[PDB]
Design a protein around this nucleic acid. Sequence first.
RNA 1: GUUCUAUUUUGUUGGUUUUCGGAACUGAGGCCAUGAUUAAGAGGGACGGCCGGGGGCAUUCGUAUUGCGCCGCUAGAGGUG
Length: 136
Amino acid sequence: SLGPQVAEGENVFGVCHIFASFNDTFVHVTDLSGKETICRVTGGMKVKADRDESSPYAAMLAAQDVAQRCKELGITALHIKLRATGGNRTKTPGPGAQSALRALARSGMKIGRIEDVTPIPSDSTRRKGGRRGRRL
RNA sequence: GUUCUAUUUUGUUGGUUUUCGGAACUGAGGCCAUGAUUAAGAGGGACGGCCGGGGGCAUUCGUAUUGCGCCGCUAGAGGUG
Ligand SMILES: [Mg+2]
Ligand SMILES: [Mg+2]
C-alpha cells in the first residue's frame, strides 16, 4: 500500500481508461500493461438517481476519488485512453469525458499521452432498431 | 454432223435416195469495250492496345459482435424523458 520503492526525480506511470458512455462514466486506472487494476470509480456510484450517472458532475467526482486513491499507491502520472461505446453503436464520447479528464489535471496528477481507443469496426453486425429506426 | 420429218422434183399408175422446208440433239469455232454499282456519320464480323464496385468459381485478410477459459480490483451495471 506504500507504493514503489524509488528515489524522486522521475514519475511513475499508470494508465486510466475512461469510458464516457451516455449512461455513466468509468474512470479506471491500471498499470502500463493494463492487467492490474489499481482504482476503478464509476460515475454512477457518486449519485443518488440513475438519471445523473452520466452527468459531468459525477465524472468530476469520480476522477477526484480516483486521483486521491492513486496518490496513495504512489502513481504520479497517467496516460489517457479515451473511449466511447463505439463498436456497432455511437462513436462520440459522452458528456463526462471533458469533466473527468479535467479533474485529473487539477488533482495533482500529471497527464502523459492522450489517445482514442474507441472500437471502430471494419463492419459490424446489424444495428439495434428497426429499418425505420428508433422513432419517437 | 445424227435423228424424226412437211411436200415443190422425176409425162400418166408403183420402189429407193438427195436437195428442199419444219422439229430435236450434238462437235469445233468468231465475237461482245464480253459479263460483279458503290462501300451508308446502316449493320454483322475479324484485328490492336486498353478500360470497368460487369458475371461465375476458388483463395486471402480486417476490426467489430456474441460466447468460453484464466488473471486484477472492486459494488454496482444496464437501459430511459
Ligand atoms: Mg419493435
Ligand atoms: Mg418527430
